């Protein structure tokens, strides 16, 4: 009951909550477009490995473990070992940047270093240089960086200067120091840079430094580790990582696995399907995840994205920190990072390593196939779990860097793409995070893969990215991505949802980049859109029309292609579409087509005039969206027509005069926004948007189930309670009628009103009185007498309110007002004018004034008056329905709708009583007339009896009941005299009787007279369902009478 009371009826204006929601968007966080792509060009390897010579401060020897680059120099001798080690160092660096320029010095002195640095600077003056200093054979550094370089005589220590080194390499640069007291060098470096800056007031911000350990500590002398531990960690992330694992673990959990097998693990570092390949992939994923989840974005983008070598070195640095911590060394870097050895992700690494190694023995011994770990599957699972309920007010997922890695392979790509799509379906903030990690440059590569099954995923992802970030610098039209989407659109078997998203994408890239303008013609996009104009789906119709409108902007080639194929011939058929959004899209595309085609004029002036007149027909549409678009489209045509209006406007102040009349009509039409624009067009001539509303749709969630289906939401419990309340009030009204109607000598309301209360109406359930005078509507509390705010209708001066009605019982309870000039306005909150009148619409009918009767069971507005016909509009489509012809030669005072018999009920000013049957052919809907009257007929209506007998009153006062199927009457009552219409309320069996005197001669439905009741009459009315009268008087007051 509570639902059906109002939800068996159309709610005509629910769309009005969205039609005007025209908006743009906020700015985007800057920026994923990492334009700064500075790179490393050359590497200088400076070795001081003076094999066979121990500086005097060396403590020796048993645990010295003098293993360098996995070489033991004692087995080769002082010269072979040095060259061999240098070769291995070169190989270790080539694994990370094979294109680097190689430069090497073995025991250089002074001029050798100056010349090296100068030559490298000359090779690339703007790019980065890496300077790697070993120092193992050199005494502990001093504040100046003194080094044991000499002509094979140790007594020539040669003091050096960090300041001078900075001078030689003034370019952006990266320094690596393997010195014992390495931090001392960094401190001196910074102090000298400051000194130089101060001297320049009469390089600090460009250098990156990695030091093995702090200035106050020495590198460990451990018999089982390589001497060059820091270098090994930075250049060979595996190897030592596994050796450490074997040594560090207190109690091994994998019996039988030791170094003898670790050094026999097969495979290439880059062979993704081997043990080492998988381990390198996992290592990279973990170290990137830690960096993402620890550092601020300002550092993350600079260190892990701008340069391949910098990112690799810092990625390995985190490992060096973790390992060297256990030996009382603290690696030092500049810029300084927060500590990371505490992060939980390192436990995952150890687990993965443990799992791998348990298979190593048998694979070596028996040759069993290698099985892959579940690492990425579990990480994807955890992400999927997070997605269960994501909100903005939460920490972002910690695993986005893992998804990025998964997308690079061909095993879990489909799952990662699905989960990414689901993530991106959240509001715009979700997209920004995805952009900040670098999905974009990878999905651009996936866009051109040979796979076909990926189509709906790449389409969805790109639809969301473009919906949020349309600024992408033409990447989809510089490369072949646009061709992909054209093919996607072409596929006749793809679901409409994806065709719609593809059409959206194409519209965006065409209007956004101004380079896709030729490509969309090379692929015959126009032909595809024209074929697709007949698609039944509303959104494909809208977006295809938008694509065509956007194509026909400033193209010369598809000015000609447009005219050549008579594209407009098909677009105007969309002007018949029941849905106003499609009509708006069609008006946009058609107006743009002609406005731009007219630049040639030539023979196309034939088209120019015809379209102008086809648009003229749309003045009858009634929709404010279509109407506004009509005004804009006409203005676009006016731009071209002004060349001839310069000699036509003088007449206004023969298609030109028709256009003048159309624009004048549109200006006159009661939509001030439209009127204003139309007047600006008319004035401009005399003196001399929708696409964004539609576009914002795709930025919303679409996988979300709307609140309307949430059976526990407060909005449902509250609305249902209020619905029951209203129903119970109706029941109270029924009970007071059923208990018996007595003389109406009780009182409810008396208040002084503004103006003359000529129209008095009440809400079906809510005790609120709505009374109109000529110009304005006042409102009152039906029971308390409290005065409510009034609302001036806003109609032109000298107009008059003719009729008022309510449209729905509970939810869409709008107040509709009709006037003599045809204006029909609807407002949502007569109920709450104190805070927001909330105007709904402002239609105009009748192309007696205006009399209306809207059919709530059908959603139809019926109107008559000074047109001599009956007009029907579909208020659920914003479209004219029909003009109903009549043989009458006079106007009417009626009208009344009979929704159960499809009958139009009138009395006529010519004295006859005429009714119409909506089912008859529209030549004349002749059913009756009745011919027992000659004087004008006043308000008439049908009785509650199933037969459909009609009550009709003459201006002479005669009251007569007529037979619904014969021209003869049923009876004559003569209840009242003289010219008094009978307002009857069948539910209450009450008959009102107004007069020139200050009283109402109330009768019962039986015709019996009750002595005149007092609390010139202006208006008679009844509160629906209640046996209570209301009368307005020409003394500026209204009153309400009640059963005693």
């Amino acid at each position: 009951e509570a639902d059906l009371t109002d939800w068996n009826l159309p709610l005509a204006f629910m769309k009005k909550r969205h039609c005007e929601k025209i908006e743009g968007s906020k700015s985007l966080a800057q920026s994923w477009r990492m334009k700064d792509r500075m790179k490393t060009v050359s590497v200088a390897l400076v070795l001081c490995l003076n094999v066979g010579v121990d500086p005097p401060d060396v403590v020796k020897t048993t645990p010295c473990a003098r293993l360098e680059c996995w070489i033991d120099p004692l087995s080769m001798g002082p010269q072979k070992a040095l060259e061999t080690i240098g070769a291995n160092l070169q190989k270790q660096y080539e694994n990370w940047q094979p294109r680097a320029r190689y430069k090497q010095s073995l025991d250089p002195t002074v001029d050798e270093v100056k010349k090296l640095c100068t030559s490298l600077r000359r090779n690339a003056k703007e790019e980065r240089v890496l300077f790697h200093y070993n120092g193992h054979g050199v005494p502990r550094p001093t504040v100046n960086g003194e080094v044991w370089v000499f002509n094979k005589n140790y007594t020539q220590y040669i003091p050096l200067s960090i300041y001078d080194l900075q001078t030689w390499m003034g370019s952006p640069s990266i320094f690596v120091y393997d010195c014992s007291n390495a931090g001392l060098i960094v401190k001196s470096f910074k102090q000298f840079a400051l000194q130089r800056e101060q001297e320049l007031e009469v390089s600090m911000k460009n250098c990156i430094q990695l030091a093995a350990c702090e200035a106050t500590e020495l590198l460990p002398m451990i018999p089982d580790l390589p001497a060059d531990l820091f270098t090994s960690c930075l250049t060979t992330p595996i190897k030592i990582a596994l050796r450490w694992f074997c040594m560090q673990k207190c109690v091994s959990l994998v019996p039988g696995v030791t170094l003898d097998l670790i050094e026999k693990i097969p495979g290439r570092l880059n062979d993704r399907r081997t043990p080492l390949g998988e381990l390198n992939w996992i290592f990279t994923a973990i170290t990137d995840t830690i960096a993402w989840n620890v550092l601020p974005r300002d550092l993350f983008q600079k260190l892990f994205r701008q340069d391949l070598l910098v990112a690799s070195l810092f990625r390995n640095f985190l490992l060096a920190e973790r390992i060297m911590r256990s030996y009382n060394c603290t690696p030092v870097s500049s810029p300084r990072l927060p500590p990371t050895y505490m992060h939980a992700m390192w436990q995952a690494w150890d687990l993965a390593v443990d799992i791998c190694l348990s298979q190593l023995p048998t694979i070596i011994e028996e040759g069993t196939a290698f099985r892959h770990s579940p690492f990425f599957a579990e990480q994807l699972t955890a992400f999927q779990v997070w997605l269960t309920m994501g909100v903005e007010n939460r920490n972002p997922p910690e695993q986005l860097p893992i998804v990025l890695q998964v997308l690079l392979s061909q095993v879990h790509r489909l799952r990662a793409l699905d989960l990414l799509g689901r993530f991106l379906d959240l509001g715009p903030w979700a997209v920004s995070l995805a952009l900040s990690v670098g999905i974009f440059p990878y999905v651009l590569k996936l866009l051109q893969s040979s796979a076909r099954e990926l189509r709906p995923l790449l389409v969805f992802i790109w639809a969301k990215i473009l919906a949020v970030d349309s600024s992408c610098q033409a990447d989809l039209v510089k490369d072949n991505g646009h061709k992909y989407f054209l093919s996607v659109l072409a596929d006749p078997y793809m679901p409409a949802e994806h065709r719609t998203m593809t059409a959206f994408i194409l519209a965006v890239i065409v209007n956004s980049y101004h380079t896709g303008q030729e490509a969309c013609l090379q692929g015959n996009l126009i032909a595809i859109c024209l074929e697709q104009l007949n698609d039944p789906h509303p959104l494909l119709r809208q977006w295809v029309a938008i694509c065509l409108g956007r194509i026909w902007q400033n193209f010369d080639s598809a000015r000609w292609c447009g005219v050549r194929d008579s594209a407009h011939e098909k677009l105007y058929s969309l002007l018949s579409d029941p849905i106003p959004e499609v009509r708006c899209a069609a008006v946009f595309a058609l107006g743009t087509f002609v406005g731009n085609s007219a630049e040639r004029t030539d023979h196309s002036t034939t088209i120019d005039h015809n379209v102008a007149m086809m648009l003229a027909q749309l003045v009858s549409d009634g929709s404010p969206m279509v109407r506004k678009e009509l005004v804009v489209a006409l203005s676009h045509l006016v731009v071209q027509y002004e060349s001839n209006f310069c000699t036509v406007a003088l007449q206004f102040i023969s298609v030109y005069t028709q256009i003048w009349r159309v624009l004048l009509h549109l200006a006159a039409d009661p939509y001030p926004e439209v009127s204003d624009v139309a007047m600006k067009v008319l004035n401009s001539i005399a003196y001399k948007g929708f696409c964004d509303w539609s576009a914002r749709y795709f930025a919303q969630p679409v996988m979300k189930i709307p609140e309307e289906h949430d059976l526990e939401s407060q909005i449902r419990k509250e609305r249902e309670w209020r619905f029951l309340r209203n129903s119970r009030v109706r029941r109270q009204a029924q009970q007071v009628i059923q208990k018996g109607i007595t003389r109406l000598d009780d009182q409810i309301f008396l208040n002084r009103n503004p103006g003359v209360p000529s129209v008095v109406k009440f809400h079906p359930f809510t005790p609120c009185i709505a009374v109109a005078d000529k110009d304005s509507i006042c409102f009152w509390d039906w029971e308390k007498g409290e005065k409510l705010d009034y609302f001036h209708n806003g109609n032109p001066r000298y107009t008059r309110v003719t009729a008022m009605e309510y449209l729905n019982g509970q939810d869409c309870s709008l107040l509709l007002t009709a006037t003599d000039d045809g204006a029909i306005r609807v407002w949502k909150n007569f109920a709450d004018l104190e805070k927001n009148p909330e105007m709904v619409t402002a239609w105009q009918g009748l192309s007696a004034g205006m009399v209306v009767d809207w059919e709530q069971e059908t959603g139809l507005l019926m109107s008559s008056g000074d047109v001599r016909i009956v007009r029907i509009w579909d208020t659920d489509r914003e479209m004219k329905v029909q003009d109903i012809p009549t043989g009458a030669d006079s106007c009417v005072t009626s009208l009344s709708c009979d929704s159960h018999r499809s009958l139009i009920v009138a009395g006529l000013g010519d004295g006859s009583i005429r009714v119409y049957d909506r089912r008859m052919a529209l030549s004349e809907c002749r059913v009756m007339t009745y011919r027992e009257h000659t004087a004008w007929v006043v308000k008439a209506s049908l009785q509650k009896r199933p037969d459909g007998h009609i009550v009709s009153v003459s201006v002479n006062g005669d009251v007569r009941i007529f037979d619904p199927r014969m021209p003869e009457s049923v009876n004559v009552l003569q209840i009242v005299k003289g010219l008094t219409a009978l307002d009857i309320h069948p539910q209450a069996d009450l008959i009102a009787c107004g007069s020139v005197n200050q009283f109402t001669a109330i009768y019962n439905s039986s015709g019996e007279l009750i002595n005149n009741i007092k609390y010139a009459i202006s208006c008679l009315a009844f509160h629906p369902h209640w046996p209570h009268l209301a009368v307005g008087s020409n003394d500026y007051y209204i009153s309400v009478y009640s059963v005693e």
Partner: peptide
């Protein structure tokens, strides 16, 4: 181009 290789 890309920092990481893709098995396109």
């Amino acid at each position: 181009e890309s920092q990481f290789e893709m098995d396109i």
